[model samples]
Target: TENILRKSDEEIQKEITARVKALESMLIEQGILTTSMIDRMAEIYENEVGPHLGAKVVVKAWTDPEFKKRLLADGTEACKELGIGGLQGEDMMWVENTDEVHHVVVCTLCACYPWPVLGLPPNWFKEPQYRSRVVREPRQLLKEEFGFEVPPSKEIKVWDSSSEMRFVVLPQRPAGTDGWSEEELATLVTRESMIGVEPAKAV
Candidate 1:
């Protein structure tokens, strides 16, 4: 039992963080990188980069059915129309949740996510428990893990993404948002909703 026991999550996380810091320090000491350079990179990612672009794409899809049709038809191509594509975003598959069906995505083999659209994948998304369980019991996992309760009558579709393509969910637009501006609507979009783990924020 002692030998088979695994490190706790906190311990593992701390260890990883410590190792990264050590690596960064070494790089800095060797003049391969500087603290300021690292700071600038962090600033860029925090301010100019990340999932806000995904929210913009979602807002466009919500407001324009034609665009939504295009996105569903060719997700990567549609994203390029909005100037959103790179890295993990080069090949995207859009799955939309409608009145009768709820869609969720997971990469059962690895974290093959739309990174540019969704930014970084959350740690839990890559964990074996979530990747395995979400596919097997999507409705249950949605409710229990993410505080989302899809109606029992609504079919829960778990889309398993692979290296060939990554998926991003186009959650149904919230009610009372009929006249909302794209900028306003974007605020309601959450990374989790884009992954189909939860609905967009309520109006």
Candidate 2:
């Protein structure tokens, strides 16, 4: 049998889901929380408070230059202007990836990401190795660990997130996407792109 010390993301998610289901059942049996309550929580997180809000925000940024400036200046307020703020997003800040600069984010103290905007942090974002390596050497880590390389002329900036504040990356609007409506642009945004580990899909 092959060594399986580190599980794949799919395996990790499956295991966590099954474990959570078991714990939820036990809690229901113990009167800790009702089934309906837990189900409602899942519904809220899965459908209502997911990456869709973040995508909408990014879409606006891509379409409106003034809004993009405001977002980079004050992410929390800019997001609220678009009706996208609440839990895990009170102190959000925006950084951007440009022709001269590349931006990436990591939560130095656990995975305290801008959840309301970016949805829940991915498993790798919470891993100790990622949290540390991305900070120690962002350019090298971006190329080696993530397969995304920054041009030598571009400076890499690694932002560390904490409970007090967090950041989301404003990915450069893909080329050939000129004149696209916000709705069309939204489709190109993804959670990974928001975190700056990858670029938004090219149109």
Across residues 1-203, which tens digit of lDDT does each residue of candidate 2 receive?
35768888899999999999998888888988996886898897888887878999898988888999899999999999988998889888888888998889888778888878877877898989888888898888878887887888888888887557878999999999989888888889999888988888876
Off by over 4 Å in 1: 1-44
TM-score of each model, paired residue for residue: 0.82, 0.83
Candidate 1 — what's its lDDT?
Answer: 0.88
**Candidate 1 C-alpha lDDT tens digits along 40-111:** 877866776677989998999998989999999999999999888887788898888899989899999987
Task: Score residue 99 of candidate 1 by CA lDDT.
Answer: 98
User: Could you give me the TM-score of model 2 versus the true structure?
Assistant: 0.83
